[PDB]
Every structure is written in structure tokens, then in C-alpha cells.
Amino acid sequence: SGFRKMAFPSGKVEGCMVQVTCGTTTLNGLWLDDVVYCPRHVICTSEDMLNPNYEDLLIRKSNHNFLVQAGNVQLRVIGHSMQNCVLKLKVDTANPKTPKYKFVRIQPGQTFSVLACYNGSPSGVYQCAMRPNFTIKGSFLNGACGSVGFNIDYDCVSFCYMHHMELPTGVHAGTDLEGNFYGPFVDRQTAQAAGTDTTITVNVLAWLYAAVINGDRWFLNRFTTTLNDFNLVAMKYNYEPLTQDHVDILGPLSAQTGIAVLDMCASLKELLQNGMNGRTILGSALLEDEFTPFDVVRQCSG
Amino acid sequence: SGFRKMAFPSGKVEGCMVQVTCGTTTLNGLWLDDVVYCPRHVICTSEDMLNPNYEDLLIRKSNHNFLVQAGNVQLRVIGHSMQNCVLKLKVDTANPKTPKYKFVRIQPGQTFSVLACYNGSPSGVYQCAMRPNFTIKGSFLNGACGSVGFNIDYDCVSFCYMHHMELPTGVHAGTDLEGNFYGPFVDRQTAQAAGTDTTITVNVLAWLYAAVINGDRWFLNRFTTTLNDFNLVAMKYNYEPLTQDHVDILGPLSAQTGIAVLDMCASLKELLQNGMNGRTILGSALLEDEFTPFDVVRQCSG
Numbered sequence: 001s002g003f004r005k006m007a008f009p010s011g012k013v014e015g016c017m018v019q020v021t022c023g024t025t026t027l028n029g030l031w032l033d034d035v036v037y038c039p040r041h042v043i044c045t046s047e048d049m050l051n052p053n054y055e056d057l058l059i060r061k062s063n064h065n066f067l068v069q070a071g072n073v074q075l076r077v078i079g080h081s082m083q084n085c086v087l088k089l090k091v092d093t094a095n096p097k098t099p100k101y102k103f104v105r106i107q108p109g110q111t112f113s114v115l116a117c118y119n120g121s122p123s124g125v126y127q128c129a130m131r132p133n134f135t136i137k138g139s140f141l142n143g144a145c146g147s148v149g150f151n152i153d154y155d156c157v158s159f160c161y162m163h164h165m166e167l168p169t170g171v172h173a174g175t176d177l178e179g180n181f182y183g184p185f186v187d188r189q190t191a192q193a194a195g196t197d198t199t200i201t202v203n204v205l206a207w208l209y210a211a212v213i214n215g216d217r218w219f220l221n222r223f224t225t226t227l228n229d230f231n232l233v234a235m236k237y238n239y240e241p242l243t244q245d246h247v248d249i250l251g252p253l254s255a256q257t258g259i260a261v262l263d264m265c266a267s268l269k270e271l272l273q274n275g276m277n278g279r280t281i282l283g284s285a286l287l288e289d290e291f292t293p294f295d296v297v298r299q300c301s302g
Numbered sequence: 303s304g305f306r307k308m309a310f311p312s313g314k315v316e317g318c319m320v321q322v323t324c325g326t327t328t329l330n331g332l333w334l335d336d337v338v339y340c341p342r343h344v345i346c347t348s349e350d351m352l353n354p355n356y357e358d359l360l361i362r363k364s365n366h367n368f369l370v371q372a373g374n375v376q377l378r379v380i381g382h383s384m385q386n387c388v389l390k391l392k393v394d395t396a397n398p399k400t401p402k403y404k405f406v407r408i409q410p411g412q413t414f415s416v417l418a419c420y421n422g423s424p425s426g427v428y429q430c431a432m433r434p435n436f437t438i439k440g441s442f443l444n445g446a447c448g449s450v451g452f453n454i455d456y457d458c459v460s461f462c463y464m465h466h467m468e469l470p471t472g473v474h475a476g477t478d479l480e481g482n483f484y485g486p487f488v489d490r491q492t493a494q495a496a497g498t499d500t501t502i503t504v505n506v507l508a509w510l511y512a513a514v515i516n517g518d519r520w521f522l523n524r525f526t527t528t529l530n531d532f533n534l535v536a537m538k539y540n541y542e543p544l545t546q547d548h549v550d551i552l553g554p555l556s557a558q559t560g561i562a563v564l565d566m567c568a569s570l571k572e573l574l575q576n577g578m579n580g581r582t583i584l585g586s587a588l589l590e591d592e593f594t595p596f597d598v599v600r601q602c603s604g
Contacts, residue, residue: 001472004441006426009417011313115311118604124308125427137585139306141604170303170517215472275580276587283439285578285587302420302443 003210003282005290006299007113007125008152015097018075019120020089020146021067028117028146029068029089030159030177032098036068036075036089037177038146039164040082041187049189058082069120070095084179085164085187099157103177106160108132109200109240111292112149114161116140129290130161131171132240133197134183138163138172148177167192199239200289202246205264206296207288209253211281213300218279220259223266230265237272249293256300305512305584307592308601309415309427310454317399320377321422322391322448323369330419330448331370331391332461332479334400338370338377338391339479340448341466342384343489351491360384371422372397386481387466387489401459405479408462410434411502411542413594414451416463418442431592432463433473434542435499436485440465440474450479469494501541502591504548507566508598509590511555513583515602520581522561525568532567539574551595558602 020029020038024045029038041049043057061080066089068075079090106112108130116124116139128136128149140147140163149161164174164187171194173185185192212220231241247261254261268287276285291299322331322340326347331340343351345359363382368391370377381392408414410432418426418441430438430451442449442465451463466476466489473496475487487494514522533543549563556563570589578587593601 001443001468002439002441002474004428004439005307006418006428006441007309007312009312009316009424009427010309011311011316011424014311014313116308122311122313123604124601125311126306126308137304137306139304139308139601141303141602143604166303172304278577280588286582299426299441300443302425302445 001214003214003299005127006295007127008150010113010115010122010125012099012152012157013115013148013150014122015099016095017115017117017120017122018068018070021069022061022065026119027143028120030146030148030162031068031070031075031091031095032101034091034094036091037162038087038089039162039175039187040085040087040179041145041164042066042087052188054082054187071120085175085181086162086177086179100155101157101159104151104158104160105176105178105180106130108134109203109292110160111290111295112151112160114138114149114163115147116144117147118143127290128161129200129203130182131197132200133195134181134185135167135171135173135194135197136161140166140172167194169194196238199237199287201234201239201242201268202249202293203289203291204239204268204287205242205246205250205261206253206293207282207291208264208268209250209257209259210291210296210300212257212259214282216281219267219271219281220263221267221270223270224260224262225266225269226262227265230262230269233269233272239272252297253293303516305516305601307429308597309429310452312415312417312424312427314401314454314459315417315450315452316424317401318397319417319419319422319424320370320372323371324363324367328421329445330422332448332450332464333370333372333377333393333397334403336393336396338393339464340389340391341464341477341489342387342389342481343447343466344389354490356384356489373422387477387483388464388479388481402457403459403461406453406460406462407478407480407482408432410436411505411594412462413592413597414453414462416440416451416465417449418446419449420445429592430463431502431505432484433499434502435497436483436487437469437473437475437496437499438463442468442474469496471496498540501539501589503536503541503544503570504551504595505591505593506541506570506589507544507548507552507563508555508595509584509593510566510570511552511559511561512593512598512602514559514561516584518583521569521573521583522565523569523572525572526562526564527568527571528564529567532564532571535571535574541574554599555595
């Protein structure tokens with residue numbers, strides 16, 4: 001027992017991280033088979049980033065203008081392509097450490113592990129949620145661009161995120177591995193609004209189930225509620241509306257705990273209206289929303 | 303910018319995890335060179351764990367009674383030794399994936415990454431502190447014993463922890479890689495007192511420096527204090543006493559922020575006496591003590 005924010009083991013992704021240099025600019029690429037994927041802003045100077053014409057900038061770049069290093073292994077670039085906001089560099093050598101992998105575009109509220117990298121070298125791993133407003137609350141210093149987010153399923157690495165930018169608010173924005181931004185963000189150093197970031201209600205409920213499984217039961221109250229009554233409270237507190245799809249996803253945890261999802265919603269309601277009165281749940285003094293129902297079952301079934 | 307609990311990249315340790323079976327019992331071993339290290343309680347039945355005579359139990363075990371599997375690779379055991387609370391199984395094959403490594407016994411308040419494993423297979427990675435009372439607040443289901451904690455320094459993996467047990471209180475106890483328990487714990491299913499768990503003051507201060515670096519400055523107040531005045535408050539709140547050694551360790555963060563360590567102590571004091579008034583620091587509603595000064599500089603210098 002116990003409950004921790006837990007990343008996937010990062011080894012399969014560590015083997016894929018390379019350094020991409022184009023003139024002045026160095027960031028991280030992901031080397032799968034004979035293709036290296038990196039942020040297209042690798043072709044920009046600090047100046048270009050104010051208002052880049054990526055098509056025009058890229059036209060002044062040939063294959064030999066892209067230096068790719070996998071540790072000391074220099075890779076040879078034989079082709080380049082812009083796909084949305086990512087560059088695809090065709091290299092002469094298939095990565096021998098290529099894991100079984102897929103590219104997935106994840107839904108807001110889903111979680112994933114980030115391997116934070118600098119100069120093609122891993123520094124650390126943490127768990128992140130795609131916020132409802134399509135930002136992540138990450139940890140990225142200059143040079144982290146090209147660092148990736150992923151899930152693992154037995155042998156298969158599902159890449160879902162590539163880091164591209166920090167908003168002036170200090171939250172993070174990036175793309176899927178087809179180079180399509182999550183959210184309304186662009187790869188340009190302008191002012192960008194994220195919008196209201198709401199709490200992921202189905203995740204808070206999963207984490208309450210986690211807390212019950214671990215003996216933290218103080219917040220369980222005498223009430224129940226309705227989906228409509230609970231959503232009146234969710235809207236007031238900037239929580240995502242709960243749907244019968246969400247209730248269905250919580251079924252296995254309801255079944256394990258013998259606590260009905262609407263009984264748990266009534267507990268959450270009293271928590272939202274009354275606060276925590278200075279107590280804690282699984283060592284937190286606030287309601288945690290970056291664990292999915294899958295995350296809770298993972299860490300409660302191994 | 304941003305601030306996250308960040309584990310070391312786990313790949314170097316993933317390559318070392320094997321499955322150790324002895325009759326009925328399966329747990330995780332660590333395969334370095336031609337030696338596999340595991341908890342000696344691998345030789346126990348659930349019944350034995352009530353009051354084991356490890357020397358007597360081990361005597362009824364030969365080399366061929368220990369099955370070691372590294373994925374499907376079956377290893378051949380050619381020698382066994384009990385060292386304190388760990389078994390050392392000499393195998394015929396040096397692990398080709400052996401990283402540069404050291405065994406280190408860490409001090410209370412130091413941090414490390416845990417790779418949680420089942421049947422010799424990695425499931426996840428998280429950051430842990432050795433609590434002042436020599437327990438860790440981990441996440442471990444049945445079969446996790448033999449999972450290891452480590453730090454990385456460039457190329458070198460310093461193993462500092464092997465998981466052995468869960469106390470009836472749900473916190474975790476284990477050994478260094480010489481098989482010496484942290485704290486007063488034994489590898490026996492009896493009642494065990496952890497003792498008072500105090501807050502790691504030097505870590506809370508590091509995290510306050512982290513918060514300032516990231517723009518969360520609201521808790522900075524008009525006061526300063528003395529080491530003796532602050533420690534009067536630390537004792538009242540079950541905080542570890544702050545020493546000039548701790549002040550020296552915080553020097554680089556003082557230097558970066560231009561905030562004197564005793565000015566930060568005076569802020570911490572007002573936080574302890576007044577609470578957080580329902581605000582947050584780096585997204586937490588309580589004072590965090592599982593980041594070392596090194597951890598903060600790592601995540602603020604890359």
C-alpha cells in the first residue's frame with residue numbers, strides 16, 4: 001500500500017533520445033527506426049521566434065545543415081520534411097534501440113510520463129496530465145524542447161507529447177508526434193491565452209477511491225447526490241461536468257470499494273463546499289486531479 | 303521553469319532487475335556483474351516470517367534451490383552467501399547491462415528514485431526521502447520486495463535502498479545493498495515502532511528557495527530570526543533542528559535568490575505559526591520536505 005505520483009520506467013524512451021543541431025540551435029530529437037522527430041523551431045534563431053515563416057526558413061536548410069548525434073554516434077541525414085510543427089529527418093541508420101511504439105493523440109485529462117532531456121541526454125522523469133485547457137504543468141529549463149511524453153502498455157510505448165514552448169504564465173505547450181499542437185497554441189514567441197483551467201473531476205474521484213483503498217476514509221459522509229445536483233456544484237468550483245461515461249469508467253473502483261460513484265460525488269461536494277478543515281488525503285492538503293482511473297487501478301493492482 | 307517531483311531516468315536500473323524464486327517465494331533481485339542481490343526473506347514461507355531463523359532456513363537451501371530469471375534468460379547459481387539481511391547469489395554470467403555503480407548508505411533526509419518491480423519486471427518510478435525515522439513513504443504491493451532505490455551522477459548509479467517490508471502502519475522499511483536495515487527494523491512480521499517522524503527542515507527551506515525562483519514569493523515576510531529562535535519553533539512543530547552545516551548547504555540558493563537563509567527561516571516560522579491561510583506554494587497546500595538542496599539546484603540548473 002501507499003500512493004505516489006508514479007512515472008513509467010523511462011529506459012525504452014532513453015534509448016531514443018538524440019541531440020539535433022541546426023546552425024546556432026540545439027534541442028532534443030526522438031530517433032525511431034530511420035526517422036528523427038524534433039520541434040521545427042530548431043531552424044529558428046531567438047530573433048526568428050518572434051514571427052517565424054517556417055516554410056521560408058526551412059527552404060534555406062539542406063540535409064547537411066542538420067547535425068544529429070545519438071551520444072557520440074553522429075547520424076547521417078538523407079532527407080528532411082516538415083509535418084505541421086515537427087521536422088522529420090530521415091537518417092541512414094535505423095535506431096537499434098527502437099522499442100515497439102505508436103503515436104497517439106491523447107484526450108484532455110489523460111496522464112503520461114515526461115522524460116525531461118537537455119542536449120539529447122535524459123535528466124529526469126515525472127508524471128503530467130493534459131489539462132482540460134491543453135497545457136501541462138511541467139518542469140522545463142532552456143534546451144528541454146523535443147523532450148517527449150509517453151505511456152507504456154507491456155512492450156508498446158505510446159508517444160503522445162513533444163515539448164515546444166513555455167507560455168509567459170510558466171505553463172507548457174507542445175504537440176503530438178504528428179506535430180499538431182494540443183490546444184490553440186502556436187510555435188511563436190507571442191502572448192498566448194491558455195483559458196480557464198478546470199479540475200479533472202473523474203480523476204479527483206479516482207484519487208478519492210485510491211484514498212479509501214489506503215485507509216484514508218474520514219471524508220466519506222452520510223449523503224448521496226445526483227449527476228445534475230453534483231454538476232451544479234462542479235460548475236461553481238470550475239470542475240469539469242461529470243458524465244455517465246465517467247461514472248462507467250469509475251465502475252471497477254466502485255466495485256472494489258463497495259462505494260457507489262454518486263456517494264463518492266456527495267463526499268467530493270462536501271469537500272468542495274466545506275474545504276479540508278486543515279486535514280489531508282493521501283498526504284495532500286488539496287484535491288488531486290492528475291491520477292486517472294487507470295492510474296489508480298495500476299497502482300492498486302500492480 | 304515549473305517544479306515537479308522528478309525521478310532519475312530508470313533505464314540503467316531496469317537492465318539490472320531479475321526475478322528470484324526459492325521454492326514458493328518470488329521477489330526481485332538486482333544483477334550486477336556476476337552477483338544477484340535480493341532480500342534474504344526469499345527463503346521464507348508466509349509462516350516463517352512470524353519468527354524466522356534465517357541461518358537455519360538457509361542451511362536447507364543449495365545453489366539449485368535458487369531460480370534466477372533475467373527476462374527469459376535463466377541464470378545459473380554457482381554460490382550463495384547471506385550478508386546481513388541480503389542474499390548474494392553468485393551466477394555464471396556477468397550482467398552485460400551492468401552500469402557503473404556504487405553501493406552507498408544514505409543519510410536521513412537524503413532523496414532517491416525507487417523503481418517499483420514485480421516478478422523482476424519494472425512497473426514505475428517515483429522520488430522518495432529517507433525520513434528522519436528511517437522509513438520511506440513508498441508505494442509497494444505484494445511482490446515489490448527487492449525493488450531498489452538509487453541516485454545517478456553522470457554515468458554512476460549509487461544504489462542506496464532495497465525494499466524489504468511494510469509496517470502495519472503502511473510505511474516502508476528496507477536495507478542498504480550490504481543488507482543493513484535503515485533504522486531499528488528487522489525482517490520479521492512483528493509489531494515495529496518507527497518513532498516520531500520529524501520534518502526535514504533543510505529540505506523545506508530548499509523548496510521555499512525553489513518557490514521564490516519560480517515567482518511564488520507571497521510568503522516572504524519583513525522579519526529575520528536567529529538559529530536558536532528558529533529552532534525553538536522547529537522543536538514545537540516537530541521539525542529537525544537547523545545547524546550551520548544546513549545553512550552552508552543552502553548557500554548557493556541564498557546566493558542565487560539574494561535571500562539570507564535566516565530571512566527564509568523567519569518566513570518558514572510565520573508559515574508554521576500562521577499556516578498557509580488557504581494559499582499554495584509550488585501547487586502544494588502544505589510545506590514539502592522531500593526535495594534536497596541538490597534536488598532544487600538540479601531542477602533549477604538542469
